[PDB]
Amino acid sequence: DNVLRIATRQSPLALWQAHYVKDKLMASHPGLVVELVPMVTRGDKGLFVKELEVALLENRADIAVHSMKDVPVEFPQGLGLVTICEREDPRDAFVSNNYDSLDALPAGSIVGTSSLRRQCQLAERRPDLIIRSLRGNVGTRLSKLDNGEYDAIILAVAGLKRLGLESRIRAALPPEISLPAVGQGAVGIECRLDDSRTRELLAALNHHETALRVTAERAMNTRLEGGCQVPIGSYAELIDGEIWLRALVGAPDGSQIIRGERRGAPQDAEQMGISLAEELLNNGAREILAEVYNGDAPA
Ligand SMILES: *Cc1[nH]c(Cc2[nH]cc(CCC(=O)O)c2CC(=O)O)c(CCC(=O)O)c1CC(=O)O
Numbered sequence: 001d002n003v004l005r006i007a008t009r010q011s012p013l014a015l016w017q018a019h020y021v022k023d024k025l026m027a028s029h030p031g032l033v034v035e036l037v038p039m040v041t042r043g044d045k046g047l048f049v050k051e052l053e054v055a056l057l058e059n060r061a062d063i064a065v066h067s068m069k070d071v072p073v074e075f076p077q078g079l080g081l082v083t084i085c086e087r088e089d090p091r092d093a094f095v096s097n098n099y100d101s102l103d104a105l106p107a108g109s110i111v112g113t114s115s116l117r118r119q120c121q122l123a124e125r126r127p128d129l130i131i132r133s134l135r136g137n138v139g140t141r142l143s144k145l146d147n148g149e150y151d152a153i154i155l156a157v158a159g160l161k162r163l164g165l166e167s168r169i170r171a172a173l174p175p176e177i178s179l180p181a182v183g184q185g186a187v188g189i190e191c192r193l194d195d196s197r198t199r200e201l202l203a204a205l206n207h208h209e210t211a212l213r214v215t216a217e218r219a220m221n222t223r224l225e226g227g228c229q230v231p232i233g234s235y236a237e238l239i240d241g242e243i244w245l246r247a248l249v250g251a252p253d254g255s256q257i258i259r260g261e262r263r264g265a266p267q268d269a270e271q272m273g274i275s276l277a278e279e280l281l282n283n284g285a286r287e288i289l290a291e292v293y294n295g296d297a298p299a
Contacts, residue, residue: 002031002032002033003032003033003034003035004025004032004033004034004035004062004063004198004201005034005035005036005037005060005061005062005063006018006021006022006034006035006036006037006061006062006063006064006065007037007039007052007055007056007060007061007063007064007065008036008037008038008039008052008064008065009038009039009040009041009043009044009048009052010038010039010040010044011044011137011138012137012138012139012163013067013137013138013159013162013163014065015036015038016162016163017065017066017067017162017187018036018065020085020162020187021063021065021085021187021189021205022034022036024085024204024205025201025205028204028205029201029204032201037055037060037061039051039052039055043070045072045227045228045229046072046227046228048070048228049064049066049070049071049072052064052066052190053075053076053079053190056079056190056191056192057076057078057079057192062191062192062195062198063189063190063191063198063202064189064190064191065187065188065189066187066188066189066190067158067183067184067186067187067188068084068182068183068184068185068186068187068188068214069181069182069183069184069228070228071183071188071190072227072228073218073221073222073225073226073227075190078192078193078194079190079191079192079193080190080191080193081188081189081190082189082190082191082193082199082202083188083189083202083203083205083206084183084186084187084188084189084206084207084210084211084214085186085187085188085189085205085206085207085210086186086207086210087185087186087207087210087213087214088157088158088161088162088185088186089157089158089161089172089185090156090157090158090175090180090184090185090186090235091156091157091172091173091174091175091178091180091184091185092118092154092155092156092157092172092173092178092180092184093154093155093156093157093160093168093169093170093171093172093173094152094154094169094170094171094172094173095142095145095152095153095154095155095160095168095169095170096145096151096152096153096170097145097146098151099151099152099170100170100171101170101171102122102126102152102171102173105126105129105151105152107128107129108128108129108130109129109130109151109152110129110130110131110132110149110150110151110152111129111130111131111132111150111151111152111153111154112131112132112133112134112141112144112145112149112150112152112153112154113131113133113134113153113154114133114134114135114229115154115181115229116229116230116231116252116292117179117181117230117231117232117233118154118178119131119231119252119254120231120250120251120252120253120254120257121177121178121179121233121248121250121254121257122154122178122254123252123253123254124250124254124257125177125254127254132150134150134153138155138159138160138163138165141153141155142165142168152170154173154178155168156180156184156185157169157172157185158184158185175235175246178233179233179234179235179246179247179248180233180234180235181228181232181233181234182214182217182218182220182221182226182232182234182235183214183217183218184235186210186214188214189202189205209238212236212238212243212266212269213236213237213238213243213269214236215269215270215273216236216243216245216262216269216270216272216273217234217235217236217245217273218234218273219269219270219271219272219273219274219277220234220245220247220273220274220276220277221234221273221277222273222274223273223274223277223278223281223298224249224277224280224281224285224289224298225289225293225296225298225299226289230289230292230293231249231250231251231252231288231292232247232248232249233246233247233248233249234246234247234273235247236269238266239263241266242263242264242265242266243262243263243264243265243266243268243269243272244261244262244263245261245262245263245272245273245276246259246260246261247259247260247261247276247277247280248260248280249280249284249285249288249289250288251288251291252292256284256288258280258283258284258285258288260276260279260280260283261276262275262276281298285298286298
């Protein structure tokens with residue numbers, strides 16, 4: 001019917017991604033009418049995705065736009081991820097007003113982040129730092145830093161660039177120092193699998209290479225039954241024709257961090273991620289994840 005409705009959250013970053021996807025759709029289909037259907041979410045697991053899926057199941061919208069790391073590992077029947085857009089810088093960022101790097105932070109400094117993934121890696125290297133929870137939209141996060149509530153905070157490089165706040169990035173951390181969350185930097189689109197018309201329209205937005213990388217990352221997480229908030233790092237790169245997948249699972253306090261890696265052909269992306277996950281599980285990840293999930297442990 002030439003009309004496409006986009007379901008999205010109401011934060012500045014969520015609306016940015018909605019426009020980004022709209023612009024792409026318009027560029028490849030100049031006669032389409034695009035409508036934004038703003039929602040709200042519990043996050044405002046899968047607290048920040050559920051209302052959007054409901055919108056899709058009862059035909060209130062046609063597609064839902066998410067940041068790949070927020071997309072849940074399991075989907076209600078009839079729904080699924082069908083498009084993965086070009087990946088932006090996938091690195092974590094060091095944001096601070098008073099210090100230029102993590103090394104310069106004196107013992108006792110307060111670093112803010114609610115991510116167990118960012119936390120376990122920070123505690124492993126610097127046991128002297130105090131890691132405190134931090135929640136809210138990027139804008140309120142930056143406010144609490146500015147109000148002297150935190151000495152430094154950790155945020156994704158992609159979020160800040162997208163919002164035109166690149167100047168806040170004191171330092172982009174290498175993946176070797178802070179392994180990214182699965183799909184960090186990529187936008188993914190979910191819709192009703194049987195909606196051939198919508199899916200046909202989406203094809204031009206899919207970025208092959210990014211889809212390959214993210215597939216390896218997600219298969220790893222799906223096996224670990226991971227979710228947006230667990231001490232899990234999962235990051236893949238396309239190096240000389242092969243995918244190089246790295247993963248880690250760590251105790252929040254940094255005492256124990258289990259690491260592993262895989263290298264192989266693009267078409268083996270899913271099996272690779274599942275294999276790496278099982279290697280971590282049989283190496284202690286299971287015990288750590290069971291303490292995090294508390295009882296519920298991966299198969
Ligand atoms: C799963 C998870 N979500 C968030 C919050 C979040 N979601 C999207 C972004 C923007 C960057 C992107 O699109 O990838 C953000 C905020 C950000 O990371 O800058 C987090 C971070 C929680 C926190 O640090 O308090 C997570 C968990 C994780 O990254 O491990």
